[PDB]
Design a protein around this ligand. Structure first.
Ligand SMILES: O=C(CCCc1ccccc1)Nc1cnccc1C(=O)O
Ligand SMILES: [Co+2]
Ligand SMILES: [Mg+2]
Ligand SMILES: [Mg+2]
Ligand SMILES: [Zn+2]
Length: 435
């Protein structure tokens, strides 16, 4: 039906500051039935100084900051043309280049003055601007502390705050600078984590969204139309989605509106006017989020795609410090930890059978999680390490399989252990369901 395929977008207005910190807001935003939530006038309700994220202020703060530019052909939000301009296509490719905030700002500003749409046919979209530097963006980041706990960049209830190190763009803030038509290709978030997006303005963003439930159908369209779902750049053809009985949420994000994207929600975005957007990810400690995160973590492994969130590392840290009261979530984490212990044990036994030494490395403060140099899989605890350079400057971490796959096998490879069996066992036994 036409009505069901065009469902109303979940919306909230906060009449006061008290409403923003209400438990009702959390359960609404995280409800699996709500794939996306727009909070109207959130900035004003919480008195957020969005002027700190204005183009003028950003240029003053760091004019030489790196801006990743995406050159694009401008086209209506419901269109993506082939080279002949006679049919709709899924792939939406863009050329990548680099510039500065100051230089993109001038393009953004001049372009705005040209119209008394912009840049004619071809436009540039300033993406992936890094606001992780605490000293450089102090007033900007401090301003975001006015948000309720579950939406903050850092909180005890956010899985990404238990990683122990920086994951660029997930537990640090990214800035987008846009002109009309600036297009954000379709995707789910890294490891199906939730996301927060605030429109700074002055212009609007147009949003499109599909519930996580339909993601495999979206992936099959991408495969049918010759583009990588997880890693490629694509723009859904809306008629294809409606022809497959897939409801599409459509709404406008006006200046000061916060968009909350729930776990696994497929979404694509286009700027209607000139605007800046700020964004980051959040991983609420719930069974719904954890399940979706683990299954993308595994699916990533099947498709040889790096999981940007090291879910095994995160699950252990969470287990070590956070009390989980939900039985369903506890079961999932407890199982993940047990599987990890068994996996580590199997590796140690095989290494000891082969007569291969294992040195205890230990962990240090602010140490990153390790990934395989070849296949990009998370390498937890047992590290197969080699020296690429003649000196001890360049160390490469490999997984068991890739280490074994080397021409000389494990010769030259030093095997390290970051957590002893007893460390994991004692952390595991300490992890119990909260009352
Ligand atoms: O991912 C991005 C940056 C897209 C940059 C890009 C990459 C590849 C091709 C064109 C543009 N942006 C968003 C993601 N999710 C929600 C909203 C946005 C946004 O642009 O406000
Ligand atoms: Co997104
Ligand atoms: Mg991306
Ligand atoms: Mg599912
Ligand atoms: Zn590997």
């Amino acid at each position: 039906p036409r009505e069901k395929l065009n469902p109303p977008t979940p919306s909230i207005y906060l009449e006061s500051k008290r409403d923003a910190f209400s438990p009702v807001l959390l359960q609404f935003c995280t409800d699996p039935r709500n794939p996306i939530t727009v909070i109207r006038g959130l900035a004003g309700s919480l008195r957020l100084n969005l002027g700190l994220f204005s183009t003028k202020t950003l240029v003053e703060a760091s004019g030489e900051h790196t801006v990743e530019v995406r050159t694009q052909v401008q086209q209506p939000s419901d269109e993506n043309w082939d080279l002949t301009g006679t049919r709709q296509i899924w792939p939406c490719e863009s050329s990548r280049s680099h510039t500065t905030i100051a230089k993109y700002a001038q393009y953004q500003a001049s372009s705005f003055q040209e119209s008394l749409p912009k840049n004619h046919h071809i436009i540039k979209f300033g993406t992936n601007i890094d606001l992780s530097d605490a000293k450089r963006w102090k007033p900007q980041l401090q301003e975001l502390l006015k948000l309720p706990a579950f939406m903050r960049v850092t909180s005890t209830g956010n899985m990404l705050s238990h990683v122990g190190h920086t994951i660029l763009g997930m537990n640090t803030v990214q800035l987008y600078m846009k002109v009309p038509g600036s297009r954000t290709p379709g995707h789910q978030e890294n490891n199906n984590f939730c996301s927060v997006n605030i429109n700074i303005g002055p212009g609007d963003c147009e949003w499109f969204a599909v519930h996580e439930h339909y993601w495999e159908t979206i992936s099959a369209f991408c495969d049918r139309h010759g583009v990588d779902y997880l890693t490629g750049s694509w723009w859904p053809i809306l008629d294809d989605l409606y022809a497959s009985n897939i409801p599409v949420y459509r709404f406008v994000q006006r200046p000061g509106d916060l968009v909350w994207i729930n776990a696994g929600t497929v979404h694509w975005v286009q700027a209607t006017g000139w605007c800046n957007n700020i964004a980051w990810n959040v991983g609420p400690l719930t069974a719904y989020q954890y399940q979706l995160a683990l299954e993308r973590y595994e699916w990533n492994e099947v498709k040889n795609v790096k999981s940007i969130v090291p879910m095994i590392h995160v699950s252990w840290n969470v287990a070590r410090t956070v009390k989980i009261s939900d039985p369903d979530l506890f079961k999932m984490i407890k199982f993940c930890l047990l599987q990890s212990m068994k996996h580590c044990q199997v590796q140690r036994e095989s290494l000891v059978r082969a007569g291969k030494k294992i040195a205890y490395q230990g962990r240090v403060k602010d140490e990153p999680a390790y990934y395989c140099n070849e296949c990009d899989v998370e390498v937890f605890n047992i590290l197969f390490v080699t020296s690429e350079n003649g000196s001890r400057n360049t160390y490469l971490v490999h997984c068991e399989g890739c280490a074994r796959r080397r021409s000389a096998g494990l010769q030259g490879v030093v095997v390290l252990e970051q957590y002893r069996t007893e460390e994991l066992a004692q952390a595991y036994d300490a992890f119990t369901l909260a009352p």
